[PDB]
Design a protein around this ligand. Sequence first.
Ligand SMILES: O=c1cc(O)n([C@@H]2O[C@H](COP(=O)(O)O)[C@@H](O)[C@H]2O)c(=O)[nH]1
Ligand SMILES: O=c1cc(O)n([C@@H]2O[C@H](COP(=O)(O)O)[C@@H](O)[C@H]2O)c(=O)[nH]1
Lengths: 218, 220
Amino acid sequence: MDVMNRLILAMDLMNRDDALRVTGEVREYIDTVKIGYPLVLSEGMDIIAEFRKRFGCRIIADFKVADIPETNEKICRATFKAGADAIIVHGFPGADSVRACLNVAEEMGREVFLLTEMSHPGAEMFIQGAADEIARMGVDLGVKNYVGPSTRPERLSRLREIIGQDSFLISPGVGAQGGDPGETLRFADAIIVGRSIFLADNPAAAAAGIIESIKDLL
Amino acid sequence: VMDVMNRLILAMDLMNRDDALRVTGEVREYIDTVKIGYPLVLSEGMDIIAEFRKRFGCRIIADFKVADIPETNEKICRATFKAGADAIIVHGFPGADSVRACLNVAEEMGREVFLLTEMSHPGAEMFIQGAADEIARMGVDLGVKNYVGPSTRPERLSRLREIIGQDSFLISPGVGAQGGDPGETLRFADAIIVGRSIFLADNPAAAAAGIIESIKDLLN
Ligand SMILES: O=c1cc(O)n([C@@H]2O[C@H](COP(=O)(O)O)[C@@H](O)[C@H]2O)c(=O)[nH]1
Ligand SMILES: O=c1cc(O)n([C@@H]2O[C@H](COP(=O)(O)O)[C@@H](O)[C@H]2O)c(=O)[nH]1
């Protein structure tokens, strides 16, 4: 996956007008948008096709899929029918649940991203202690795309160690949650950035600023 | 606690609006509580919650297994309650701050959170099972009153009932298609969740009736 400027916009505005406007203002800087449940549940799954129509960007559906295999398969189907290129899946519910997603993605020409460790403080309670094993499970299952935390660079580095340099790794928690763009890109192929861009007075300048700060990494 | 008719909650995971509406309508004499998840919501939109309310008396549990950071969890809960869901199901494994975010929105909006502890499928044994007792204890500490636990592991469902106490409300999936028994499950759970055993039956009404007949002595 070739992410322009190694920067993925997390579009978590809940109003269609704002979401389209802000994305439009930063379109010259990005070609990959992560769309999650805040926007999809507020404006519908049709928003994905609209983004493709307007921007021709790749769409990562950040749905943190975390159900039983039967349900995971249905969620993946509905998601790819809506035009998502990839979907983010939790690893914590185990191998069979991940496999269900892998199977649908294969059938529909899409990718699964496996979320191992999360970026927020609560991740320390249960997820962190399982995260390395979740990553090894990904490797065992043939997963090639991963998500890990900008907020804990040592954990992000460990994730990179486990999955190897050939796997693709994206990382949220940059900006608002305290992660540093450049440090995160020591380990991740791409950074995910939401509020630091879309809540800015001038989202274009915000994106431009981040890119300038990592210019030697591009 | 919500008063679930016949201790039976329909998991409506059909992905076609017409079929989902038809089946739910057919079982309306037996069930007043419907669990709507992402298979249907991602296929037909959040307005489907509205349409169920309009068409049927039913309470709606939004089975969204909320599993994000606190900031995003808050947004998901707000959107979900705005759409008319009575309750939302939230994963506990992402930790206390993530659960608290959902509880705070539910409090502000006058709705309810259900905390998913252990899951019913085989993969649950890999990571979730080992954390499940602590996730449940965390729920109790946070003041969670409603829980979800697995029909497929009676011993685990029993332990989870112990942890949360007799006053907490507990619902349990994995009945029927996944192998759980309705009566055995209701030893510990207040209500059972049933999906495919009902909605894939030639006669969903008859299938619901049959389940209810089998647990008739356990009704209140
Ligand atoms: O561990 C994770 C995994 C995520 O997907 N995310 C997602 O990444 C985005 C981060 O947004 P922000 O840059 O505003 O903090 C949100 O959409 C969030 O749901 C995260 O923050 N931490
Ligand atoms: O541990 C769990 C938690 C669930 O919500 N579920 C949900 O309960 C329902 C079970 O449906 P069924 O009776 O067809 O197996 C599905 O909607 C599924 O997503 C589950 O099966 N196991």
